[PDB]
Amino acid sequence: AEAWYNLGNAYYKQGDYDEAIEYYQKALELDPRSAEAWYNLGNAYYKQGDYDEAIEYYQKALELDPRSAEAWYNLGNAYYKQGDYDEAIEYYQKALELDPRSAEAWYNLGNAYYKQGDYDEAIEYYQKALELDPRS
């Protein structure tokens, strides 16, 4: 499994997401235990624009390891990209509960409320982002 995984990683690093997907899938067939590997497979689908696949593999990562702020955040991002703003909000909140340090994540939670048309919460979360990083 580890060898196929590392070949997927090398393709991923040069932006060959369809090859990364084929080799990650072969790795996971041999050993499905790593939350990180399912997360990397989700990322490959996300980079290709196949958000429904990214969601299925991020969910599998989080079933294995639910304290990954990064997996919750990317899950939120995949729902955001489908226009599922209510889900993005839920998973962004879960991410920020685990790790409130990223200005960018507070901003994206603000963006999801804005897209819902809930301007109060958009302002609340944009203000949290700008307190952390006022440069954009």
Q: Answer yes or no whether residue 51 interacts with Tb ion by CB under 5 A.
A: no
Can residue 18 be called a binding residue for Tb ion (CB under 5 A)? yes
CB of 108 to Tb ion, least distance (A): 23
Binding of Tb ion by 52 (CB under 5 A):
yes
Give the interface segment with Tb ion, choosing from 31-39, 44-52, 95-103, 122-130 (CB under 5 A): 44-52
10 with 19: CB under 8 angstroms?
no
Interface size with Tb ion, residues (CB under 5 A): 4
Q: Does 31 bind Tb ion (CB under 5 A)?
A: no
Does 50 interact with Tb ion (rule: CB under 5 A)?
Answer: yes
- Binding segment (CB under 5 A) for Tb ion, from list 17-25, 34-42, 69-77, 96-104: 17-25
* CA dist., res. 91 & res. 76, Å (int): 5
Which stretches of the chain are DSSP H helices? 2-13, 17-30, 35-48, 51-64, 69-81, 85-98, 103-116, 119-132
Three-class SS state of 83? coil
Contact by Cβ (8 Å): 95, 80 = no
Q: Which residues bind Tb ion (CB under 5 A)?
A: 16, 18, 50, 52
